[PDB]
Paper text:
In addition to its antioxidant activity, Sestrins activate AMP-activated protein kinase (AMPK) and subsequently inhibit mechanistic target of rapamycin (mTOR) complex 1 (mTORC1)3. Sesn-A functions as an alkylhydroperoxide reductase, while Sesn-C performs an mTORC1-inhibiting role.
To gain insights into the biochemical and structural properties of Sestrins, we determined the crystal structure of full-length hSesn2 at 3.5-Å resolution. The electron density map of hSesn2 was calculated using the single-wavelength anomalous diffraction (SAD) method with selenomethionine (SeMet)-substituted proteins. The crystal structure revealed that hSesn2 belongs to the family of globin-like α-helix-fold proteins, consisting of 23 helices and no β-sheets. Interestingly, whereas both YP_296737.1 and AhpD are characterized by a catalytic cysteine dyad (Cys86 and Cys89 in YP_296737.1), the Sesn-A domain contains only the first cysteine (Cys125 in hSesn2) with the second cysteine being substituted for a leucine (Leu128 in hSesn2). Interestingly, these two residues are located in the putative active site of Sesn-C (the helix–loop motif), indicating that Sesn-C may have acquired the mTORC1-regulating function by modifying the ancestral active site of an alkylhydroxyperoxidase during evolution.
Numbering used by the authors: 66 to 220, 225 to 239, 256 to 271, 280 to 294, 308 to 328, 333 to 478
The structure:
């Protein structure tokens, strides 16, 4: 880890936990510093208010409190913190695309984009809309990281991951490895194995920053639509679109997705020789399968073969309903795995989630 920084009291509480993995922290901090501290298309107070709205969707009083204080510090109009009905017309148009990015990103059509542009009064640029979509998705994915790892506010970095015993000098798992073995050596029931996996399945003060609370991943009126990843990948399509509209953060989103996907110590909770590229691909692909994205020649039977019953319910909670994550749930999966590796899954998860959300919104922009 980056232990001298972590144990120092001079840094953010969420940043400390992330310090366990320095290769991801490098890349995460670049985007954090670009979005919230560098000259960009939107004023510095508007960026902190977009982040409140985004984090309010999951009732995250950690991130709403940070950006509330930073909004005020950076010279934001304090009326705006009384509620969303007090912010400019430009910023309320954004809370229809925000609830979708958070909860049901597949529903983002071209009409949502059109609404945000071309009107007479204070309409959004592409330069600015792109930056706001990266802020909204960044704060949704930090919001799932905060509840997943248990990050407590400032006034014990977490109640789930104990850092002070974790810092220092000191079975069935083998089964999982064996299974990983058999996969490495190796057509119409491929699409219908994805279909089964896919359908398988308070706090008064921050309701005022959202349009429609209780909008949720779940229908409550009765499975996303199936989407071929090759139609609109990150590598080919979506990276080019962010590159042309917002040059600085296109490169830093690519390096950070690739940093969290690539990240391995080649270990499996006290075993050193494995290549676990197979396990991490499953975690990444399952979370894309929750957000409706099928990969064209990936065997989705591999998922519940490698991922426990309790890792699945944990991953799906943290990705979709991040509040109502409990410590019982965090402990109840991968019981013999090290605390740093649970954080690792939170990394893969947030980044997979973000990519899915971003890809649907960029799909809506190119179709316009």
């Amino acid at each position: 880890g980056l232990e001298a920084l972590m144990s120092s009291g001079r840094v953010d509480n969420l940043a400390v936990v992330m310090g366990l993995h320095p290769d991801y922290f490098t890349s995460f901090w670049r985007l954090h510093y670009l979005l919230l501290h560098t000259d960009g298309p939107l004023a510095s107070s508007w960026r902190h208010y977009i982040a409140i709205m985004a984090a309010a969707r999951h009732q995250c009083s950690y991130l709403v409190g940070s950006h509330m204080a930073e909004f005020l510090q950076t010279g934001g109009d304090p009326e705006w913190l009384l509620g969303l009905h007090r912010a400019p017309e430009k910023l309320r148009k954004l809370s229809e695309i925000n609830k979708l990015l958070a909860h049901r990103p597949w529903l983002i059509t071209k009409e949502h984009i059109q609404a945000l542009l071309k009107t007479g009064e204070h309409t959004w640029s592409l330069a600015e809309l792109i930056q706001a979509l990266v802020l909204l998705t960044h704060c949704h994915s930090l919001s799932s990281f905060v509840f997943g790892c248990g990050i407590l506010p400032e006034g014990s970095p977490a109640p789930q991951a104990p850092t002070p015993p974790s810092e220092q000098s000191s079975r069935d798992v083998e089964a999982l490895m064996e299974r990983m073995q058999q996969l490495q050596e190796s057509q119409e029931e491929m699409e219908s194995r994805f279909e089964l996996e896919k359908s398988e399945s308070p706090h008064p003060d921050m309701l005022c920053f959202v349009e429609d609370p209780t909008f949720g991943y779940e229908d409550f009126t009765r499975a996303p639509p199936t989407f071929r990843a090759q139609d609109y990948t990150w590598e080919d399509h979506g990276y080019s679109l962010i590159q042309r509209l917002y040059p600085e953060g296109g490169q830093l989103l690519d390096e950070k997705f690739q940093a969290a996907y690539s990240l391995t110590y080649n270990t499996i909770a006290m075993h050193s020789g494995v290549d676990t590229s197979v396990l991490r691909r499953a975690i990444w692909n399952y979370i894309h399968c929750v957000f409706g994205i099928r990969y064209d020649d990936y065997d989705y039977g591999e998922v519940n073969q490698l991922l426990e019953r309790n890792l699945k319910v944990y991953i799906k909670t943290v990705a979709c309903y991040p509040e109502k994550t409990t410590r019982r749930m965090y402990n109840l999966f991968w019981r013999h795995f090290r605390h740093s590796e649970k954080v690792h899954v939170n990394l893969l998860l947030l980044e997979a989630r973000m990519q899915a959300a971003l890809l649907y919104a960029l799909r809506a922009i190119t179709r316009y």
